[PDB]
Assembly symmetry: C2
Homo-oligomer: 217 residues x 2
C-alpha cells in the first residue's frame, strides 16, 4: 500500500543526505565546498517536496474530488505554454519539441491538461535520444480528440506497458538519483484523463513509443 | 485517505529543512556558520530516518509480516531499559517515572514490546503536567498480563477514545514539531499488541488517562 510505497521512495534519498552530510562534516572544508553540499542537499529535498505535492494532487482523485473545470481550449496554445517551460531541458538534451495540429480544439481543464502534458513531456525527455524530436500530435478522430506524445527510443517491454500508470511503478530500478519523476507522474496523467471521461493508451516498438490521450469531443 | 495522510506528515520536516537550507545559502556565511547549519540538518535527517523506519515497521504489520519472536520476559527489566532512555526527558518536564510490578513476567518479543512501551511513554510525556507521575503498572488479571501506562492531565473527549490508535489521528491540530511523535506511534503500539494476540484499551476521565496492554499469560 501507500505506507510501504512512499516509505520505500524516501528511504534512499534520506539515506544519501545523511551519508553525504556526515562525510562533509568529517573533514575541514572550504566555505564553498560546504555550500556545494548544501545545494546538493537542497536538490534532493526539492525532489522530495515535488513528490509530496504530486501525492496531494493525486489524493484528490481518490475521494473522487478531481473535478475538471472545463472550457473550450486551443490545444496549440496550451502545448506552447508547456513547451516554453521545457525548452531549456530539451536544448540541454539536444532534443526538438514539436507540435502537430490543424486548428485543434477540445473542452477541458487547462490547468489539469497542462499538468498531464508536462508529465508526459518529462517522461519522454527521459528516454529520447539526442538529435531526435519529441512530437505532440493533436487531431479529431471519430468525435474524439486524440493528443499523443511520441518519442523515439528503446522500446518499453510488454510486461511494463499495462503497469506504466501505476503509482510508484518504475520500469528499471531507476528509482534513482538526479533523474526524473516523483514516481506518480504517469498515475497523475491517467487520473486527469479519466476525470475528463477519456482514456490513455501506450504503444511501444522499434518505430517509437506513443502515449495517447483520448478525450470526448 | 492513506496517501494524503502520509504526505501531510512528511511535508513538515521536508519543508523545514528546505527553508533552513535556503536561508543558509541566501547569504555569504562563515565556514563555522555553515558547519553549524549542516550539523543541525544532520539532526533533522536523523529524525526523518526514524520516521520512515517507523512507516516501514507499520507497513510490515499491515502486510501481516509482523511475527513476534517470543520468549519469557522479566517486564521489570524491560520497562527499566525504557525508563533509562526517557529519564532525562522526564526530568526536564519535572515528571516522575514510576514502575509498579511484583515479579511480573510475560511471553513476548522484547524488542517489539520495548517499542510499544516507549511509544506509550512518549505519548504520556506529551500530556502529563509538571510535578506529576507517569506510572507503568504490571500485573496478572484473569490469567493475562496487563501493562498499564497511567498519566494525569486533561481528559481525552469520548469521541477521540476509539480513534486514538488510528494512524495519523490527532486529538488536536497541535504544535507541528518534535514532542508530538511520528503520527503513527500509537498505531504501532496496537499492531504489536494485536500481533501478540493481545488487546489495547484506554480509559480517560478527571482522575487520569490509562493506556492498557493486555497480553496472553
Amino acid at each position: 500500500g501507500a505506507m510501504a510505497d512512499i516509505a520505500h521512495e524516501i528511504r534512499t534519498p534520506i539515506t544519501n543526505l545523511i551519508t553525504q552530510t556526515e562525510i562533509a562534516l568529517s573533514q575541514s572544508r572550504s566555505q564553498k565546498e560546504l555550500e556545494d553540499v548544501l545545494y546538493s542537499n537542497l536538490e534532493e529535498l526539492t525532489r522530495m517536496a515535488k513528490m509530496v505535492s504530486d501525492m496531494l494532487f493525486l489524493a484528490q482523485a481518490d475521494n473522487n474530488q478531481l473535478i475538471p473545470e472545463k472550457k473550450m481550449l486551443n490545444l496549440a496554445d496550451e502545448v506552447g505554454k508547456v513547451f516554453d517551460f521545457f525548452e531549456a531541458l530539451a536544448e540541454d538534451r539536444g532534443v526538438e519539441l514539436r507540435f502537430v495540429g490543424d486548428k485543434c480544439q477540445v473542452a477541458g481543464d487547462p490547468l489539469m491538461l497542462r499538468r498531464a502534458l508536462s508529465n508526459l513531456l518529462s517522461n519522454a525527455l527521459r528516454y529520447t535520444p539526442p538529435s531526435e524530436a519529441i512530437v505532440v500530435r493533436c487531431q479529431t478522430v471519430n468525435h474524439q480528440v486524440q493528443v499523443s506524445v511520441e518519442n523515439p527510443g528503446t522500446p518499453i517491454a510488454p510486461e511494463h506497458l499495462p503497469r506504466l500508470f501505476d503509482r510508484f511503478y518504475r520500469v528499471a530500478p531507476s528509482r534513482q538519483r538526479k533523474g526524473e519523476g516523483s514516481g506518480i507522474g504517469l498515475a497523475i496523467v491517467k487520473s486527469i484523463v479519466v476525470a475528463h471521461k477519456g482514456t490513455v493508451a501506450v504503444t511501444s516498438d522499434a518505430r517509437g513509443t506513443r502515449f495517447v490521450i483520448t478525450l470526448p469531443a
